[PDB]
Amino acid sequence: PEHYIKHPLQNRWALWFFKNDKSKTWQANLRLISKFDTVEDFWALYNHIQLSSNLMPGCDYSLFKDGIEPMWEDEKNKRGGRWLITLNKQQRRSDLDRFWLETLLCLIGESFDDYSDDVCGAVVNVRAKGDKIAIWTTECENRDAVTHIGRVYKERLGLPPKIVIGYQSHADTAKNRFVV
């Protein structure tokens, strides 16, 4: 049986695309690409779409649990925030694609133990001024979950223990609340 059943993921995920177009509101520029809920369907999707390093400036990918839209206003994001990774123009080449794929795997692989239920999704922003990768969690005031996700994420990315990453509430974005 191991040879013919697809491997179900713990959650169903939706991948979203954003393309800046000044003709439209921010929300109208956000589009759902597809959903998947197995390992096989994840890789089929990933192998079919552009690497984030090849996207035009002003585009985003977002991967969110099915039923959570990748915007502050969603009920599961309004009281949350994000662990923010900032990349300069030389880490678009060096780390953007490898960090984003590691982020995707931390999500679909439920890599944060009990607190993976606090994860809502992740976003990569490709920009001329510098790219960003972030994991969104549901409750900025849950310090245990937020700190533990931040520590695991930093190790899974392989960031040196001298670098500091920060967690910002979405209420502020719309400064750091935690640092690891």
Swiss-Prot record:
GO terms for biological process: behavioral fear response; cellular response to dexamethasone stimulus; G1/S transition of mitotic cell cycle; mRNA export from nucleus; negative regulation of neuron differentiation; negative regulation of translation; neuron differentiation; nuclear export. The keyword Phosphoprotein applies. MRNA binds at W26, Q27, W72, E73, R127, A128, K129, G130, D131, K132. One of its GO terms (molecular function) is eukaryotic initiation factor 4G binding. Changing K132E: Abolishes binding to the 4ESE element in mRNAs. Gene3D superfamilies: RNA Cap, Translation Initiation Factor Eif4e (3.30.760.10). The keyword Amino-acid biosynthesis does not apply. It is found in: Cytoplasm, P-body; Cytoplasm; Cytoplasm, Stress granule; Nucleus. InterPro entries: TIF_eIF4e-like, TIF_eIF_4E, TIF_eIF_4E_CS. Changing V39A: Reduces interaction with LRPPRC. Abolishes interaction with LRPPRC and abolishes CCND1 mRNA export. Changing W26A: Abolishes mRNA nuclear export. Impairs nuclear pore complex reprogramming. No effect on interaction with PML or viral Z protein but reduces binding to the mRNA cap. Capable of AKT1 activation. Does not impair interaction with HHEX or HOXA9. PROSITE patterns: IF4E (PS00813). Residues 7-10, 43-47, 102-109 are annotated as: EIF4EBP1/2/3 binding. GO terms for cellular component: chromatoid body; cytoplasm; cytoplasmic stress granule; cytosol; eukaryotic translation initiation factor 4F complex; glutamatergic synapse; nuclear body; nuclear speck. Keywords: Acetylation, Cytoplasm, Initiation factor, mRNA transport, Nucleus, Phosphoprotein, Protein biosynthesis, RNA-binding, Translation regulation, Transport. It comes from the Eukaryota. Pfam families: IF4E (PF01652). Changing K129E: Abolishes binding to the 4ESE element in mRNAs. Phosphorylation increases the ability of the protein to bind to mRNA caps and to form the eIF4F complex. Phosphorylation also enhances its mRNA transport function. Acts in the cytoplasm to initiate and regulate protein synthesis and is required in the nucleus for export of a subset of mRNAs from the nucleus to the cytoplasm which promotes processes such as RNA capping, processing and splicing. Component of the protein complex eIF4F, which is involved in the recognition of the mRNA cap, ATP-dependent unwinding of 5'-terminal secondary structure and recruitment of mRNA to the ribosome. Belongs to the eukaryotic initiation factor 4E family. PANTHER family: EUKARYOTIC TRANSLATION INITIATION FACTOR 4E, EUKARYOTIC TRANSLATION INITIATION FACTOR 4E RELATED. This is Eukaryotic translation initiation factor 4E. It comes from Mus musculus. The gene is Eif4e.
